[PDB]
């Protein structure tokens, strides 16, 4: 989806602010060309679109679109790629029009899209172009949202933007309910090794597949095993065939990161209730079963790339080695004989990933330091210690080391001799704070990970995996989640429409081979042509029992959950179902941060900035207003003087705390003094 992106901003194009509210809108010529749903919800709405599923770029740079040219009310198949202009000249039908099985329409009047985008009923004599199929007005991501036509554009937009943020789990289960796009837009992603020419597997492994083609020549597909993505996510590809199988050309032969048996799978299938349980799922939060953590149902691998280089300094040459200045042997136990860590050694915040030392020269010692060196009889060790200590709050095994050397003739930037990168990995469990979110925009940080026993369970003791909240459902108009939930429970338990006496009325126009469906059987309702509500009720009424004589979900689609904590049952039946929820890439560990004294900017004497370093959160103008409105004067003086700028104030306060004295009175800030010298530099006598 980054490919297939249309961005009206850029060089030559109009910028952000200079672009008024007009171009952000959705002119009615975007239909079938640029999906009106998908777009960044930040301050770029409209300025970044994605192409429709079927669109295609005109050789001049226009966005052509397919249509089925129709004549005399006879829908042909002469697929025409009408451009953006000539669509206006014509009158364009709708795909979901009752064709009479031959190209003849059924009803006399038909909807149609007239020139300026106005909608009308024309009799079936003017209609000359009909849509190739529905969901033509929708992008690649949004096509993958089940029951899209029930959700409001707000939450559908949020869903299409959060569906590009799931992280490739370690287990990668496919979803009970989807659209058609989970497969085609998964082999087109590239991240699924595709059988090139039809042949037979000869030998497999977790690293390569050797397909024997029909005639002689063979081929070995090299799996990518644990390649760091560009955002720290694993990229395993395990193969999904056996040593005797026979693959056709163009076939899926190796799952990718989020593919299960070839098709997309951006999350798991989790039994979900819709009751507000004990306040923990308050206002978009989520409570979880602990089963997710035990069985690793939500568990992302992450692979971070640490990197240091040995430079050529004026004083000497940097040197990578176990030789380190004053340091224990325990903290140098994991390193090998030549610096870099041992492949496999677990690390933690403050370990020596690459022992690297540089010369320092000479500085007039402090005589107390000289006395201590005398009393202990240690040398000077003029080499200063700048090793690659793992940054704060990172851990996990060390997957692999990639080491370079100027000596080994590999090219590097100038003034560089040895560039070493230390790939580290860690298996983040799920955990409260993380940001799960369905496919319908309904998101929310994990609120609490309940134990498995105190989770509202069904009549079969089956606990529920997560517990969404009801008050988030109505006022957001995303009942797509509810319809997905019911259809997922049907897809799970399996149904059997009793065609004892003909076929029931609701299932008159269901497809065949949906009368009976096995348990755990996937389905798919494509976007604007899917299960109608009547079909959902009809399925749900016959939802064949599990193991005992037990239809756990009554015809309305709900159940009598037993409380896991108290013990009684709930007085009213609660909705249950299997709602496909992803694990967005807003993990807590990527956000948490703290600072008590860290680095400091060179030019200004303030704390440094951002989680990259320690840094400290901004204290803008609005917070100054708030803390004045409270009338808190001393706290404001603190935050502006002896936590940011009072250069001699910082060490004095740190001393005061450590010794237990009183915090001294803050001196003049630093930015004031700098501003004063700048003004005096402008020939403005300030005194």
């Amino acid at each position: 989806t980054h490919k297939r992106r249309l961005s009206a901003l850029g060089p030559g194009g109009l910028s952000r602010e200079r672009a008024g509210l007009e171009v952000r809108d959705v002119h009615p010529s975007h239909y079938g060309r640029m999906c009106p749903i998908e777009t960044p919800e930040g301050p770029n709405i409209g300025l970044i679109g994605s192409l429709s599923v079927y669109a295609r770029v005109n050789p001049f740079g226009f966005i052509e679109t397919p249509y089925r040219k129709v004549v005399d009310g006879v829908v042909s198949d002469e697929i025409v790629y009408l451009t953006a202009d000539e669509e206006d000249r014509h009158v364009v039908a709708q795909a979901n029009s009752p064709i009479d099985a031959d190209g003849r329409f059924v009803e006399p009047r038909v909807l149609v899209r007239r020139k300026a985008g106005e909608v009308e009923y024309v009799p079936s004599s003017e209609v000359d172009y009909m849509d190739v199929s529905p969901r033509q007005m929708v992008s690649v991501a949004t096509a993958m949202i089940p029951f899209l036509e029930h959700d409001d554009a707000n939450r559908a937009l949020m869903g299409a933007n959060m569906q590009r943020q799931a992280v490739p789990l370690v287990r990668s289960e496919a979803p009970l309910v989807g659209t058609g796009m989970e497969l085609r837009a998964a082999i087109d992603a590239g991240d699924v090794v595709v059988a090139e020419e039809s042949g037979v597997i000869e030998e497999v492994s977790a690293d390569y597949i050797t397909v024997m083609h029909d005639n002689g020549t063979r081929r070995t597909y090299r799996m990518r095993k644990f390649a760091r993505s560009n955002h720290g996510t694993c990229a395993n590809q395990c193969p999904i065939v056996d040593a005797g199988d026979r693959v056709e050309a163009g076939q899926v032969i190796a799952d990718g990161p989020c593919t299960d048996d070839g098709e997309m799978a951006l999350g798991k299938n989790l039994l979900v209730a819709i009751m507000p349980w004990e306040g923990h799922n308050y206002e978009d939060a989520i409570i979880l079963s602990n089963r997710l953590v035990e069985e690793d149902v939500l568990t992302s691998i992450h692979i971070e790339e640490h990197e240091i280089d040995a430079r050529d300094t004026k004083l000497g040459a940097e040197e990578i080695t176990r030789d380190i200045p004053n340091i224990s042997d325990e903290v140098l136990a994991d390193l090998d004989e030549r610096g870099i860590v041992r492949i496999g050694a677990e690390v933690r915040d403050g370990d020596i990933l690459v022992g690297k030392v540089t010369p320092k020269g000479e500085t007039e010692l402090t005589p107390e330091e000289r006395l201590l060196r005398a009393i202990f009889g240690e040398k000077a060790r003029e080499v200063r210690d700048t090793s690659l200590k793992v940054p704060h709050g990172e851990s996990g095994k060390v997957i692999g080391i990639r080491v370079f050397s100027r000596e080994d003739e590999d090219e590097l930037p100038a003034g560089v001799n040895e560039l070493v990168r230390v790939y580290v990995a860690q298996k983040r469990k799920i955990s409260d704070g993380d940001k799960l979110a369905g496919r319908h925009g309904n998101k929310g940080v994990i609120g609490k990970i309940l134990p498995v026993e105190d989770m509202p369970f069904l009549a079969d003791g089956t606990p529920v995996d997560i517990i969404l909240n009801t008050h988030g459902v109505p006022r957001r108009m995303n009942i797509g989640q509810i319809l997905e939930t019911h259809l997922g429970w049907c897809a799970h338990s399996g149904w059997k429409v009793d065609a004892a006496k003909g076929v029931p009325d609701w299932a008159a126009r269901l497809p065949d081979e949906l009368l009976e469906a096995q348990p755990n059987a996937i389905v798919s309702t494509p976007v604007f042509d899917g299960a109608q509500e009547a079909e959902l009720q009809g399925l749900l009424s016959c939802t064949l029992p599990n193991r005992d004589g037990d239809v756990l979900v009554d015809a309305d689609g709900k159940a009598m959950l037993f409380d896991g904590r108290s013990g009684e049952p709930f007085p009213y039946p609660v909705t249950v179902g299997y709602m496909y929820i992803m694990k967005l890439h807003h993990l807590v560990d990527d956000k948490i941060h703290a600072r008590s004294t860290g680095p400091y900017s060179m030019i200004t004497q303030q704390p440094l900035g951002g989680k990259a370093q320690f840094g400290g959160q901004r204290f803008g103008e609005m917070e100054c207003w708030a803390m004045q409105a409270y009338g808190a004067a001393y706290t404001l003086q603190e935050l502006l003087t002896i936590k940011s700028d009072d250069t001699v104030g910082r060490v004095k306060v740190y001393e005061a705390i450590v010794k237990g004295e009183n915090i001294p009175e803050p001196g003049i800030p630093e930015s004031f003094k700098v501003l004063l010298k700048e003004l005096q530099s402008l020939c403005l006598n300030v005194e």
Binding site: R4, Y54, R56, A249, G262, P511
Partner: peptide, 27 residues
């Protein structure tokens, strides 16, 4: 259908779309 290693995902679609989705990276 039309993709050989496909998992048999039953579908509710009432329509038979003539054209198949293009080569998504053609653009």
């Amino acid at each position: 259908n039309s993709v050989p290693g496909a998992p048999n995902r039953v579908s509710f679609a009432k329509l038979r779309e003539p054209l198949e989705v293009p080569g998504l990276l053609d653009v």
